[PDB]
Amino acid sequence: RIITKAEGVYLWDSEGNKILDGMAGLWCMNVGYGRKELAEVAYKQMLELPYYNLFFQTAHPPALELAKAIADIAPEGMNHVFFTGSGSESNDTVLRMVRHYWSIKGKPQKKVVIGRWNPGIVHIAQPYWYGEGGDMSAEEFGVWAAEQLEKKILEVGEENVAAFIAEPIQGAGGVIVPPDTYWPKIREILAKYEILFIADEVICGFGRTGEWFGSQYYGNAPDLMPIAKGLTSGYIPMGGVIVRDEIVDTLNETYSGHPVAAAVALENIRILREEKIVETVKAETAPYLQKRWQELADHPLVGEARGVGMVGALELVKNKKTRERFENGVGMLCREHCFRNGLIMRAVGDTMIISPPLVITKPEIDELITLARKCLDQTAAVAL
Amino acid sequence: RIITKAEGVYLWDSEGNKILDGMAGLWCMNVGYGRKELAEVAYKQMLELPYYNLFFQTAHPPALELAKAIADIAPEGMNHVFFTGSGSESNDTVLRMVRHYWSIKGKPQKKVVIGRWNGPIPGIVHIAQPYWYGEGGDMSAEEFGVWAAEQLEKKILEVGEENVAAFIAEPIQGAGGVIVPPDTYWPKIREILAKYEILFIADEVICGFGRTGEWFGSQYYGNAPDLMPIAKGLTSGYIPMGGVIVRDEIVDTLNETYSGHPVAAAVALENIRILREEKIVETVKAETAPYLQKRWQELADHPLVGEARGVGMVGALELVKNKKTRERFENGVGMLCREHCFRNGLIMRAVGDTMIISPPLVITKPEIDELITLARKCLDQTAAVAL
Ligand SMILES: [Ca+2]
Ligand SMILES: [Ca+2]
After folding, report:
1. In A74-180, alpha helices (H)
2. Which CATH number fits domain A35-275: 1.10.10.10, 3.40.50.620, 3.40.980.20, 3.40.640.10?
3. CB within 5 A of ion ligand 1: which residues?
4. For chain B, what is the largest distance between any 2 Cα atoms, rounded to a whole number of angstroms?
5. How far apart are CA B170 and CA B156, in angstroms?
6. Which of A225, A291, B312, B382 is positioned for an S-S bond with A242, CB 3.0–4.6 A?
7. What superfamily in CATH does domain A1-34+276-384 come from?
8. Beta-carbon pairs below 8 A across chains A and B
9. B59 to A23: CB separation less than 8 angstroms, yes or no
């Protein structure tokens, strides 16, 4: 089976079957497929002035306009953006920035970066209530998971710690939506220590939560935000790091951004802004998606349905009260039914996930929900 | 000065003045500016199937064809390529691979990578660069080549082989001043590498995709590296992309994100196709580079020029105040020469008091003549002011 075209939220195989791409390529095709404007802007920039030269610049350098355009939608006080080739490059880049920052402040011992489960890096607990909450409520567990950050800081010693790094919501790990008490508690902990906050926005960035950034959805004011994916809606490779102004001022005592990529990202943000795609997500599309997605919680196979904005997860279990999982693996089986039925929904163990294009319509959401329920029924038949 | 269009080797500013881009953007615009084919393939890939999806493969995935295309021109035995977003990403990637390699072989202590000055970063140490003009002292070129290579063996023993993962080196150091090593350098390095347990990383970000007249600098000098970071010339700078080309034995071990974005890959595939089917690299080797290097030597007669050197489609000029002693001017001259270049419409980079070129590979013999005329003018104007 072979893909020959794509348009909106749909792929078409060579036969003529439409597949609803519920994962937006790789959490990235935010304006959907077939957006001619993006190809046209790339084409023109490539012919006109594809790249930099050592002496002189162009009329309206797209990278500069892009940086201003991102400065206008980023959290307040984050008006610098350093461009890269990719999201993984942005993650390497942020780790270097944080270490250089503290080194320039005269504290080169602050090297350790604290991340979350799922070589100068240590890990704390992820705020995954369903899998790791034990006997606690969501609210209590959110507090506890946040407190693991303070505990790790003290254990490693503040004077050895550079930064905490975290996605607002962990994507690839299973759309792990944290309790509402998680981020407020983390902010309290960050306020007490000398530690930079890296908010990894590679997935959540450019509209995915209904705000421009996951950080704005939860009310976080980070120091650095790696971005990619939604930056270009996956149409051309590009990454970046958005940086709080004070951090840059310190750093001021390769990242220009390729003009073709920058032209595409600028047009992509323009479309997201001028067609009110992120506004529509917040006001209409995401509330509708999350409401319909909850209906799947009734399904005999589903232990929990969760989500925020345009992401969601379903936990597939054998027993809803104990959260006991099936032997072997229901997720792989459910995925195969997804594959057969023409719905792209990723399996992460026994967790099913979606991340559709942000332009997905209410009828398209209905289709997604119908296909998902069908796949859950077929999986239950085989498993229950 | 503001650039409004570009074509072949030329930029045009808003007033219609032509600037000869002697640096090929940043050592990367190998097929020149204005190659419609590259924009067309990007456009079509972007509209049709811009990216991966989780379930089903695409008709003719450009990244797979690109990997085959690079396997066909890479040094022999290097038939795997891992894609990245950029050359600096490829350099991070390759340092991780060499450390993972030795870790999988059961020797996670081999972590240290030996590079060269002008090539703190934990896990990297540096040896001497084979820069005869600046650091050759009282040695001949041939003997200094040997000595600079021997510093690698000395560093290996000093660090201890059991702590060493790899040696990393460009065939010719580009950004450092087109430091062309003596002919005895690479053969001696190969002898040293053969005696130790050490991977050879040949950094081809600049030298790659035709710049020396071979596809890779490694082929120009007869090296057989284990890993080669690439970027730039991969797409001729039209779309960001990087990669790492890896020797098959290394991969077999490693087998005990790098897919390459389809739009970039379509452009790189078309770019290599053009370089191959128009015989651009062959023409460089047989015609263009010999002509460039011959004309570039003529500037050695200039009162300001202590040495002219180059290989393929790169070159350097050393600006000195006294040709007999190699004494340099009091804190300047490179930037002054660059300002004259800027004014006269030639892009030549200044690295200290070393002037450097790296033109597009499609540059013609009349264009080379123009470059040489402009360079000599810039040297005259610089001498007038400084000598
Ligand atoms: Ca702002
Ligand atoms: Ca052969």
Report:
1. 87-104, 129-132, 138-156
2. 3.40.640.10
3. A 71, 79
4. 68
5. 18
6. A225
7. Aspartate Aminotransferase, domain 1 (3.90.1150.10)
8. 184
9. no
